[PDB]
Amino acid sequence: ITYGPIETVDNEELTEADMLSFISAAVNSTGLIGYNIKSFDDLMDNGIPQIVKQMFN
Secondary structure: OOOOOHHHOOOOOOOHHHHHHHHHHHHHHHOOOHHHHHHHHHHHHHHHHHHHHHHOO
């Protein structure tokens, strides 16, 4: 990918309250709890069948 040249980016007015927005985006994507829910659902969907087919023979 040919990203735009870094000389043309406008950030002079970027503050710390603006970076708190990036913190908010990261937390919203993560969900603050999600990882264990995804680990359990991945277990249920892939792992238990995978353990059955590959480890229970």
